[PDB]
Write a protein that binds this ligand. Structure first.
Ligand SMILES: C[S@@+](CC[C@H](N)C(=O)[O-])C[C@H]1O[C@@H](n2cnc3c(N)ncnc32)[C@H](O)[C@@H]1O
Ligand SMILES: Cc1c(Cl)c(C)[n+]([O-])c(Cl)c1-c1noc(-c2cc(O)c(O)c([N+](=O)[O-])c2)n1
Ligand SMILES: [Cl-]
Ligand SMILES: [Mg+2]
Ligand code: NA
Length: 217
């Protein structure tokens, strides 16, 4: 880092307003700061509640997140994981990864979440043999939108999905992931559900796609 950034200001706002070890207060602080002061690409409170419902329904034991940013969604999912369950979050921006680690420490979720430093297209094919992953129980896609489809394909080709694995994809309407949608909605290897919501901190309509893997063809 070379100066003050939006992401550093978000982290400072958490550290000055939230309660350490209280994930809810961390999420409220980030949402308050980004509603009142600086828009940011956190998944946000409205879409977060859909995320909350998915986590509580499927109780995943191992979650992979693509795109950590400041750690909002990592904190948001990890606080609802069952004891022993784990979240891996991939982040290629080292400055963001350092912020995310500080957010996890502050929220008290550092023992449940591991930051993988690097790009998803490089790390996903290495998950089985470098990070000892068998299969993933849930995947949250929220990185650059042109990577949703090839990384989904990569998750499939690398044998990281099993029957019942949950793919939850942010931003499928805005900025929009039409190619990802057409793939998962048109493949009999996925059962899809679209969740109406709003772009974080705005009243532009957005949505999440839940795509449940059904096993190989
Ligand atoms: C929208 S932010 C994620 C926000 C986070 N999921 C939340 O709701 O709090 C997208 C992040 O993905 C990272 N990113 C983009 N492409 C990536 C890739 N191929 N592999 C790993 N990280 C990537 C960017 O650095 C950025 O931090
Ligand atoms: C803010 C905004 C508005 Cl007001 C309008 C009208 N439109 O059309 C657009 Cl496209 C945007 C917009 N740009 O980027 C994002 C965004 C949101 C994410 O949740 C996310 O994850 C990522 N990302 O790049 O990872 C990007 N949203
Ligand atoms: Cl919101
Ligand atoms: Mg997003
Ligand atoms: Na634990």
């Amino acid at each position: 880092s070379m100066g003050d950034t939006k992401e550093q200001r978000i982290l400072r706002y958490v550290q000055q307003n939230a309660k350490p070890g209280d994930p809810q207060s961390v999420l409220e602080a980030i949402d308050t700061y980004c509603t009142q002061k600086e828009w940011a690409m956190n998944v946000g409170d409205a879409k977060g509640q859909i995320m909350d419902a998915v986590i509580r329904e499927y109780s995943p034991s191992l979650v992979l997140e693509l795109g950590a940013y400041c750690g909002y969604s990592a904190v948001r999912m990890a606080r609802l994981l069952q004891p022993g369950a784990r979240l891996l979050t991939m982040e290629m921006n080292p400055d963001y990864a350092a912020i995310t680690q500080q957010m996890l420490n502050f929220a008290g979720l550092q023992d449940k979440v591991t930051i993988l430093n690097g790009a998803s297209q490089d790390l996903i094919p290495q998950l089985k043999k470098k990070y000892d992953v068998d299969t993933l129980d849930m995947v949250f896609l929220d990185h650059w939108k042109d990577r949703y489809l090839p990384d989904t394909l990569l998750l499939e080709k690398c044998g990281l999905l099993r029957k019942g694995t949950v793919l939850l994809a942010d931003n499928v309407i805005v900025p929009g992931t039409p190619d990802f949608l057409a793939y998962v909605r048109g493949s009999s290897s996925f059962e899809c559900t679209h969740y109406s919501s709003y772009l974080e901190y705005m009243k532009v309509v957005d949505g999440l796609e839940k795509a449940i893997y059904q096993g190989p063809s």
